[PDB]
Design brief:
part of a larger assembly, 9 chains, A alpha+beta (about 500), C alpha/beta (about 110), D alpha+beta (about 100), E alpha+beta (about 90), A: about 500 residues, alpha+beta, Barwin-like endoglucanases, 4 domains, 6-stranded mixed beta barrel, 4-stranded antiparallel β-sheet, 16 strands, C: about 110 residues, alpha/beta, Eukaryotic RPB6 RNA polymerase subunit, about 15% helix, flat, binds magnesium ion, binds zinc ion, DNA-binding, RNA-binding, DNA-directed RNA polymerase II subunit RPB1 (chain F), DNA-directed RNA polymerase II subunit RPB2 (chain G), nucleus (chain E), DNA binding (chain E)
Chain lengths: ~500, ~375, ~110, ~100, ~90, ~160, ~100, ~375, ~130
DNA sequence: CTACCGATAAGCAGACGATCCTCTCGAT
DNA sequence: CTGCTTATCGGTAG
RNA sequence: AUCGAGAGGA
């Protein structure tokens, strides 16, 4: 139930993981993100040029997605972006931001121990971007000063040249979100570290798990934060007249309020200090819209409750995206019922009860062979057992067989699809959880029975590990012939 | 002992004994407890320990280590448990419920890890065994390239038996009127007597059978014959001497070559690895090796001709059958073993519920952690 | 082959890889009292030639890395002296087939 | 009904993959997105019925491809994108 | 470079037998076409199930499908449903 | 202990031996003792066995324990399955744990290692170290919802 | 179980004022070395000092309890071979009859 | 448990901090028989039966006598309490009330749904317990007491008396961990802090037998870490403590320690001035218990013993809430007065603050951070009389 | 009757063995210038009503007790007037799976003065094939 | 004899925890 | 019931 | 319909 694409279709082959550049973020987006509001520009119920819309997805079931068009059920939701005036750290990379800042000194921004050291020579040649960065770190964490010059390897004296100014490098520590060190206090600003990575030599990236084009430390700390679209944070609830938005929408509002809380102090009434108090909260929200499980403070009220979610806890294991909605999806065409056992059945058989048979369906193409039985099936309809609902035509249009004017008729042409009830001897997957096996997952033959149980053979008791003490059991029905093969042959 | 007193008292019309005689439900403990006595209850290995510091219940004195005070139920479930007894029994039962709800918990953490550690491990095509990186694990799946589905337990006759009983069994000496094949066993037996071209082929057979016995005993130091091996030769043989209806009174029509150069040429046709280059065909040999012990083994001029007399028509079929069945037992390139191998260990793991060595799921928890902190360490010096 | 009988001060192990192409291997006497390769579990390890490596690497069509690996300070690998690139062959006995060939490149 | 991670694993044992793609695409969610041949992400504006796919910044008009992935995946990648990570999808076997 | 590859008809290391997975999706891929009113290459002996026909077409070796078997390094070996032996 | 050993007549007779069992472990110094047979001394510590007798002995020793876990409870699981598991642990070079510390750092494609325990970070450093996911493994193709290179999809049909 | 109840919890004060008025040397005025034959006295885990000869102190307490004068909830734990006597008036102890 | 919470516990929780800054000072509490003032209407005597049909709360009004008659809020009443009325009604009267004679109540009730308060179980305070520690732990045994009062707020000041150094490990010192403090303090300094200066008198509070040399030898290493500090005044001085503590002190940090030992250190026994020996004996009793288990003369203290566990039931359950709820009503009147400086009662707080908790499970109002969450008050369950 | 099953005499079932009544209760209130209303619904520019038949509801928007309910039949008809950009449906149907007869219907009011309703539906349930025991 | 560097030992802290399932209650 | 980080101790070099 | 809790089934 979609459209038709001059663009070809293909399997996904490679997956590349990287980072976002200011260059991308600002050109990849279409939205601008100006106002911290959501809707109602002085009561005017629409979209607003603030957070939700200006060249992005809609809500009132409209094709007004900006030539994106067509239906919420099609537009993936571009995106826009939010111009952070003051540079802002990244949350999961606090560990590594430190780590790199413990590998590169100040002022010029250069590798601490070159090829001149005769231990670092076992790092610049080793394969893998992962173990290489674990090698370098071990050496340039003790040495502080950028060094004058400095050997000369190999040998006697006096010396050679390479370049650099010999300033001391601090002992960096973790303080919530800030990085502070001791020299022999000075806190390393976000503006201060971005400028260290805005330079840095080309062979300084590759040397430690990075890439010229894909991922840079100057991108690791966040210049311009991307704004996720609406289909990632839906709307109303129990009103249709009293809003009720999501929750990632609430946190982006907190950043947007804090972002134009600094520009109302830069080009407006400008205090000299205690303005760093506002730099913590604008960093804190991008540090909390991305993760909320570190150390210090959680979050709470509004227009909602507490604590918070913050992407990562949509990703984290179980009931989140990967392990809950990707690895193990919920699925259509399925059934569950309490099992009871039947000695007058055949081993591979499974008594599917009548009402479940009227529910579940298999799409069958109309082929000159089956018409005689298939048209009778249309005529019997979705009530009497050997029947069917839904008839699919040339142009993909849906005949609902349990309403409509022309349902006690329909002349079936060739190559039309007809979803039919399950009939006897169809091949169906029949499992019991907890599924410990292949053999808790066995195909079966169908015989439609009266009474509400799934009936099955006592000798198939063991591999599923079932009683009749009330064990319920699942049943899945294929939808392609190929699958129908791969069930009764494997 | 009380149990076995109740076991040899149950008459043959006694229904409980009959279900046990069937293997249908129940066992010896079930009998012992219902009819005789339920025995000594245990919590954390040790018999009921004191709560009330130096006594189990306040119905007893202190420092009383006798049987009833520390939780021995003298009566059976038919007779009735006593006030005390009942609480003791309760204490035991509760631990059962407790560890069950903690076993499956610990098992499903095992199972999931196993499944996730092996996963992408499948055969393919070069019949080896590898992951997504294409980092090889096994060069031949299960070291022999056989699916476990087909495989069966089969005694290796070469492994057991006396040096006196062995010759008797396998040696065919034509130059020896007391060790020849009787002219009643072979069509040519009397003419085959003597002969120096067929006593370099039989000496070729008997010498490989002895190289086999020294080779097997070096592998199976246990002395155990019975081992998992493809293709049930015993049943191909039972199929031979009932399909062709052979009388054990009239002599075979086989030649000594038919047998000896038969088995040696079938051996060539038991393909597993196929590559025509030096290294592959060298591993081809090093995969059939055990199954070729076993087929010689079995079959053995003396075996074929004296133990289960076979005709040339039947024997050619048997040889044809073994090659046929053998090619069916090979793993199918594509078999996902990752999962299959995890599932096969994680399943009985779930079926463990309760003598000093750590065992059960708790131990298995160490093994799969590569634990430095292992509960029971032990040298076993010989 | 250095055969020390107590311990080595770490100021001496840094003067080991300082004379190429020659190699020096330090061995303790407490680790040499009994031959490990004699033990039930340990099977016979057989070092192979660089020409036979390429023979393995092409005829099983592998990548350098894709082979099962053995450690540099591995008890057996020290007993035969395996550098990086040097592969061993291991002829272990199995209850499924008499023999089975294993290979380990030294990482 | 949920076809759990533990349940998937059993279908893998059986070597039935055409069924697992049926159960994770045709049932549940299937979605038709649109990738830029150059930049690799989900930027392409689907100006369908008008044949236009003009992804600006990369100035793409021709080099754009269609793929069939679950909506949960698109949800995953977007979330990564918003967490400042590029999860790129490429069309060809070689690099 | 597209392309090659590819591994010639000589020097075939692979099982000449058809694998149970190769079988199941040969029937599979055919029963997809059979179900969809497409030319049949055998005589239909009163059977009407689109998978049941693909079995008969297989017994007589009248399926024009060609397997590509992929080996880890990248190489593939082409096998027709004529050279492959069905023995399961 | 009971041993089964060949008599000069041919048969195996039952010859009982004397065996000592210890509550501690130090294989580095026990086998070096005059009296015991240092070609049979066994430990239930496959971690020590590895350290002393080489990685390959480490395998079987780790196998013997996976074996005794199973067979002690009256079950039999076929050699190939344990032998697989065992060997997966061993083939990286040392003893690779079946936990997030072991088999999850091992150079495998990110998406596949995502679908486990340290889900988020795996994605993070993948963004940092510019990881290229190969997408030839199971979980990677489940995520993208495609014909997974498993049994059926290991090969590819043509005309 | 059927018989069991929860302690409601009384005022500890009348017990205190009773003990010190029936022997019972307060903790301050206690000298350990010259009165080792001493049962220390606890009330809701508060050490209120030492009592010499607790034998007759017990049977007076137990009688007052069984009569009603001391709330029948209040539990009176005399340790013989530890020289302690604890009197508990908490709100949560589980008790039964017999 | 609920009758003790009404007929008393309610009274005294009202008092205490009630007195304000003139002198708005609370007194007696009168408790009505369950009523409901419904909108544009009269005060109605709500019976059980009516409550359930109508989605009402079977709660009575509190009235409290304030000083220089007044509605405070509404307390959910437990059925067959006190005055579910009911607890007066004869069998015949029950049917007319459409309430079951088999109904035993338990369960009062909120928004028309019947709710049961589930007995909570925790470990009792004010008991001395000794615990043998693991292997990689520097300390071997620890004497723990969850010292907390019964009539005076909710201060849980946990005290640890540790015994470092393993068996074998040379010189087994004993130190203790005090509340407001930061570092650990040797015990000999604690005593000297209370007012016991001469050793030997020290080991008298601890060891109660002159013959018992073994214990005495055990304490020898402690004293060695003491005689840096040989006078009272300096024993309160070694409470410092560390890195930096304001700086400006000496005469201010001495008075700092002099409070911690009376207000925090064993908050039972007492909390006032003239008690120092009452505590040092108890502290000595702890050390006696700790070393009595280190010589293995007495066992390590049993954690699962039911007689050292208490049940918090419906009564003292509601107490927890009412204390917190009443103090939020109190400290609202203090802030209404502040802006007055020239009626006021927010009765909904207590009314709805009890209802919210008794309806959900989150025993503690809108915070939920109190992990009492565990479904305190569950939705009865009436499938069968026995259930 | 193998593996924790049992065979139950149908004849006894019919004379009354393990038969049971089953009661379920449905609930509704009004609002929180804008108030919800009880009435048998109609189109009304609403075009977002439930699937089943409202035909069993009289005029107050409730079922009468004698009636018989089954499947997606509406039990409480209740509309909610919304501006916003008339009356949007907020009717509670009978449970997807359930069926049977209305037992009692309660019309009352709450502390605030809200029109409040509790519908009690009753089914007889007979010891069927998969019922646990 | 003193100062710097390396190695080892002790002390503190983290990331999950059976699978599915059906119901009830309260909340921005 | 475990890996990583910090502190302390013994050793070598200037 | 979303979140948070508890009860029960295998
Ligand atoms: Mg059962
Ligand atoms: Zn769009
Ligand atoms: Zn520099
Ligand atoms: Zn792009």
């Amino acid at each position: 139930g979609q459209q038709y694409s001059s663009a070809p279709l293909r399997t996904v082959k490679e997956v590349q993981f990287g980072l976002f550049s200011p260059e991308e973020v600002r050109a990849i987006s279409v939205a601008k993100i100006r106002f911290p509001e959501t809707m109602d520009e002085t009561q005017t119920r629409a979209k607003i040029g603030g957070l939700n819309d200006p060249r992005l997805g809609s809500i009132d079931r409209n094709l007004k997605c900006q030539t994106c068009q067509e239906g919420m059920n099609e537009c993936p939701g571009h995106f826009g972006h939010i111009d952070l005036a003051k540079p802002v750290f990244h949350v999961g990379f606090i560990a590594k931001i430190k780590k790199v800042c413990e590998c590169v000194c100040m002022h010029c921004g250069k590798l601490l121990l070159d090829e001149h050291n005769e231990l670092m020579r076992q790092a610049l040649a080793i394969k893998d971007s992962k173990k290489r960065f674990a090698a370098i770190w071990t050496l340039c964490k003790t040495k502080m000063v950028c060094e004058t010059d400095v050997p000369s390897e190999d040998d006697p004296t006096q010396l050679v040249s390479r370049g650099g100014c010999g300033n001391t490098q601090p002992t960096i520590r973790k303080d919530g979100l800030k990085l502070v060190g001791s020299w022999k206090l000075r806190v390393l600003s976000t503006e201060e570290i971005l400028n260290i990575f805005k330079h840095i030599s080309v062979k300084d990236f590759t040397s430690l798990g990075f890439n010229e084009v894909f991922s840079r430390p100057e991108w690791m700390i966040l210049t311009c934060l991307p704004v996720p679209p609406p289909p990632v944070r839906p709307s109303i609830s129990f009103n249709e007249s009293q809003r009720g938005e999501d929750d990632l929408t609430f946190k982006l509002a907190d950043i947007l309020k804090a972002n134009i809380s600094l520009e109302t102090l830069e080009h407006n009434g400008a205090p000299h200090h205690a303005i760093e108090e506002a730099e913590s909260l604008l960093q804190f929200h991008v540090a909390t819209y991305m993760d909320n499980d570190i150390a210090g403070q959680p979050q709470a009220l509004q227009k909602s409750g507490r604590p918070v979610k913050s992407i990562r806890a949509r990703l984290k294991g179980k009931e989140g995206r990967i392990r809950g909605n990707l690895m193990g999806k919920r699925v259509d065409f399925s059934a569950r019922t309490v099992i009871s056992g039947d000695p007058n059945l055949e081993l591979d058989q499974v008594g599917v009860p009548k009402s479940i048979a009227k529910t579940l369906t298999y799409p069958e193409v109309v082929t000159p062979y089956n018409i005689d039985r298939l048209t009778q099936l249309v005529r019997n309809g979705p009530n009497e057992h050997p029947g069917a609902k839904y008839v699919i035509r040339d142009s993909g249009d849906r005949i609902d067989l349990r309403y409509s004017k022309r349902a006690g008729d329909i002349q079936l042409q060739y190559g039309w699809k007809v979803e039919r009830h399950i009939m006897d001897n169809d091949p169906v997957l029949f499992n019991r959880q907890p599924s410990l096996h292949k053999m808790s997952m066995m195909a079966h033959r169908v015989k439609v029975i009266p009474y509400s149980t799934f009936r099955l053979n006592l000798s198939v008791t063991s591999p599923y590990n079932a009683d009749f003490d009330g064990d319920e059991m699942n049943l899945h029905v294929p939808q392609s012939e190929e699958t129908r093969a791969e069930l009764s042959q494997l | 002992k009380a149990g076995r007193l109740a076991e040899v008292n149950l008459k043959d019309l006694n229904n409980v004994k009959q279900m046990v005689m069937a293997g249908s439900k129940g066992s010896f403990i079930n009998i012992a407890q219902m009819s005789a006595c339920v025995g000594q209850q245990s919590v954390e290995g040790k018999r009921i320990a004191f709560g009330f510091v130096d006594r189990t219940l306040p119905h007893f004195s202190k420092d009383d280590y006798s049987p009833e005070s520390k939780g021995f139920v003298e009566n059976s479930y038919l007779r009735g448990l006593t006030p005390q007894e009942f609480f003791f029994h309760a204490m035991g039962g509760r631990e059962g419920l407790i560890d069950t709800a903690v076993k499956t918990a610990e098992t499903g953490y095992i199972q999931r890890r196993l499944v996730k550690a092996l996963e992408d491990i499948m055969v393919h095509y070069d019949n080896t065994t590898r992951n997504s990186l294409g980092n090889v694990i096994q060069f031949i799946y299960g070291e022999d390239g056989m699916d476990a589905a087909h495989i069966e337990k089969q005694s290796l006759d070469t492994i057991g038996g006396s040096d006196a009983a062995f010759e008797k069994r396998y040696r065919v000496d034509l130059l020896n009127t007391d060790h020849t094949l009787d002219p009643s066993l072979l069509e040519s037996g009397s003419e085959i007597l003597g002969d120096l071209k067929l006593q370099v082929l039989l000496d070729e057979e008997y010498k490989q059978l002895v190289k086999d016995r020294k080779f097997l005993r070096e592998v199976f130091v246990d002395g155990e014959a019975n081992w998992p091996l493809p293709v049930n030769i015993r049943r191909i043989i039972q199929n031979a001497q009932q399909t062709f209806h052979i009388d054990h009174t009239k002599p075979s029509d086989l030649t000594i070559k038919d047998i000896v150069l038969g088995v040696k040429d079938l051996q060539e046709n038991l393909l597993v690895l196929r590559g025509k280059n030096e290294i592959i065909q060298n591993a081809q040999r090093d995969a059939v090796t055990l199954f070729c012990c076993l087929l010689r083994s079995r079959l053995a001029t003396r075996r074929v001709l004296q133990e289960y007399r076979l005709t040339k028509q039947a024997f050619d079929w048997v040889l044809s059958n073994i090659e046929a069945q053998f090619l069916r037992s090979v793993v199918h390139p594509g078999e996902m073993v990752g999962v299959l191998a995890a599932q096969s260990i994680g399943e009985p793991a779930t079926q463990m519920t309760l003598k000093k060595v750590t065992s059960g799921v708790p131990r298995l928890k160490e093994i799969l952690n590569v634990a430095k902190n292992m509960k029971t360490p032990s040298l076993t010096v010989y | 082959i250095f055969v020390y009988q107590n311990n080595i001060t770490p100021s001496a192990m840094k003067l080991v890889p300082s004379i190429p192409p020659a190699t020096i291997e330090t061995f303790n006497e407490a680790a040499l009292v009994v031959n490990i390769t004699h033990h039930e579990l340990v099977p016979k390890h057989i070092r192979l030639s660089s020409d036979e490596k390429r023979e393995l690497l092409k005829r099983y069509r592998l990548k350098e890395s894709q082979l099962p690996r053995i450690q540099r300070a591995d008890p057996v690998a020290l007993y035969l002296g395996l550098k990086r690139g040097e592969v061993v062959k291991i002829i272990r006995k199995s209850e499924t087939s008499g023999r089975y060939a294993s290979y380990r490149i030294c990482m | 009904l949920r076809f759990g991670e533990m349940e998937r694993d059993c279908m893998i044992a059986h070597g039935a993959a055409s069924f697992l793609k049926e159960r994770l695409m045709e049932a549940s969610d299937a979605f038709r997105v649109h990738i830029c041949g150059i930049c690799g992400l989900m930027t392409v504006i689907a100006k369908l019925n008008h044949n236009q796919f003009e992804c600006k910044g990369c100035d793409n008009k021709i080099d754009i491809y269609q793929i069939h992935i679950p909506y949960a995946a698109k949800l995953l990648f977007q979330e990564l994108m918003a967490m400042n990570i590029t999860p790129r999808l490429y069309t060809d076997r070689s690099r | 470079t597209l392309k090659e590859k590819a591994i010639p008809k000589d020097q075939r290391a692979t099982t000449p037998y058809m694998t149970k997975y190769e079988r199941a999706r040969i029937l599979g891929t055919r029963a997809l076409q059979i179900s969809m009113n497409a030319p049949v290459f055998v005589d239909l002996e009163g059977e009407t199930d689109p998978l049941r026909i693909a079995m008969k077409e297989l017994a007589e070796k009248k399926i024009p499908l060609v397997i590509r078997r992929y080996l880890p390094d990248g190489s593939f070996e082409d096998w027709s449903v004529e050279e492959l032996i069905v023995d399961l | 202990y009971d041993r089964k050993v060949p008599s000069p007549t041919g048969e195996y007779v039952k010859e009982p031996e004397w065996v000592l069992e210890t509550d501690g472990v130090n294989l580095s110094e026990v086998m070096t003792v005059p009296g015991i047979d240092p070609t049979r001394i066994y430990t239930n510590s496959f971690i020590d066995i590895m350290e002393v007798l080489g990685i390959e002995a480490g395998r079987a020793a780790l196998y013997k324990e996976v074996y005794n876990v199973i067979a002690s409870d009256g079950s039999y699981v076929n050699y190939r399955h344990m032998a697989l598991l065992v060997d997966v642990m061993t083939t990286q070079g040392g003893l690779t744990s079946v936990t997030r510390h072991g088999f999850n750092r091992s150079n495998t494609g990110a998406l596949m290692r995502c679908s486990f325990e340290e889900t988020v970070e795996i994605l993070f450093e993948a963004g940092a170290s510019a990881e290229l996911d190969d997408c030839r493994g199971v979980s990677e193709n489940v995520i993208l919802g495609q014909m997974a290179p498993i049994g059926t999809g290991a090969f590819d049909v043509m005309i | 179980s059927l018989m069991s109840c929860i302690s409601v919890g009384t005022d500890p004060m009348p017990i205190i004022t009773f003990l010190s008025e029936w022997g019972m040397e307060p903790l301050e005025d206690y000298v350990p070395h010259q009165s080792p034959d001493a049962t220390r006295v606890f009330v809701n885990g508060v050490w209120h000092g030492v009592h010499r000869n607790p034998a007759r102190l017990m049977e007076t307490l137990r009688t007052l309890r069984r009569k009603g004068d001391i709330n029948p909830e209040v539990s009176m734990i005399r340790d013989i071979r530890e020289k302690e006597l604890k009197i508990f008036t908490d709100a949560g102890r589980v008790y039964r009859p017999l | 448990s609920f009758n003790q919470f009404v007929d008393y516990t309610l009274q005294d929780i009202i008092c205490e901090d009630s007195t304000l800054i003139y002198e708005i000072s609370f007194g007696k509490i009168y408790v009505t028989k369950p009523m409901v003032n419904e909108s544009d209407g009269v005060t109605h005597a709500l019976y059980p039966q009516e409550a359930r049909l109508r989605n009402l709360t079977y709660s009575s009004g509190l009235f409290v006598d304030v000083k220089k008659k007044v509605f405070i809020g509404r307390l959910p009443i437990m059925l067959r309490s006190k005055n579910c009325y009911l607890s007066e009604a004869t069998e015949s009267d029950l049917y007319k009330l459409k309430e079951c004679p088999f109904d035993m109540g338990g369960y009062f009730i909120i928004n028309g749904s019947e709710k049961v308060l589930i007995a909570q179980e925790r470990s009792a305070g004010n008991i001395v317990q000794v615990f043998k520690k693991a292997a990689p732990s520097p300390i071997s045994h620890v004497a723990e007491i969850r010292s907390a009062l019964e009539k005076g707020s909710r201060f849980i000041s946990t005290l640890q008396v540790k015994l470092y150094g393993r068996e074998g490990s040379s010189a087994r010192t004993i130190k203790a961990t005090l509340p407001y403090i930061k570092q650990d303090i040797p015990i000999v300094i604690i005593f000297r802090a209370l007012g016991i200066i001469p050793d030997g008198e020290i080991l008298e509070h601890i060891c109660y037998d002159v013959n018992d040399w073994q214990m005495l030898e055990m304490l020898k290493p402690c004293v060695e870490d003491g005689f840096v500090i040989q006078d009272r005044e300096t024993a309160l001085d070694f409470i410092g403590r560390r890195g930096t503590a304001l700086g400006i002190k000496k005469e201010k940090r001495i008075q700092y320690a002099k409070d911690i030992l009376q207000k925090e250190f064993l908050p039972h026994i007492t909390q006032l001035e003239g008690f120092e020996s009452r505590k040092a004996f108890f502290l000595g009793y702890m050390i006696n218990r700790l070393l009595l288990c280190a010589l293995d003369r007495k066992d390590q203290d049993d954690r699962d013993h039911f007689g050292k566990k208490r049940l918090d039931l419906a009564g003292p359950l509601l107490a927890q809430l009412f204390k917190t709820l009443f103090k939020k009503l109190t400290k609202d009147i203090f802030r209404y007065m502040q802006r007055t400086v020239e009626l006021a009662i927010n009765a909904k707080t207590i009314t709805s603050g009890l209802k919210y908790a008794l309806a959900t499970g989150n025993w503690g109002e809108q915070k939920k951070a109190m992990s009492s969450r565990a479904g305190v008050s569950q939705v009865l369950n009436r499938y069968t009389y026995s259930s | 009757n193998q593996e924790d099953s049992m065979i139950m005499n149908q004849s006894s079932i019919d004379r009354g063995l393990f038969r049971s009544l089953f009661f379920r209760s449905y609930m509704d209130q009004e609002k929180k210038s804008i108030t919800e209303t009880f009435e048998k619904p109609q189109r009304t520019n609403t075009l977002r009503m439930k699937h089943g038949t409202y035909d069993k509801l009289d005029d107050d928007g409730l079922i009468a007790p004698g009636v018989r309910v089954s499947g997606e039949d509406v039990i409480i008809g209740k509309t909610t007037p919304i501006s916003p950009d008339s009356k949007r449906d907020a009717s509670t149907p009978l449970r997807s799976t359930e069926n049977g007869i209305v037992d009692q219907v309660l019309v009352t009011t709450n502390q605030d003065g809200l029109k409040f309703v509790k519908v009690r539906v009753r089914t007889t349930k007979i010891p069927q094939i998969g019922d646990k025991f």
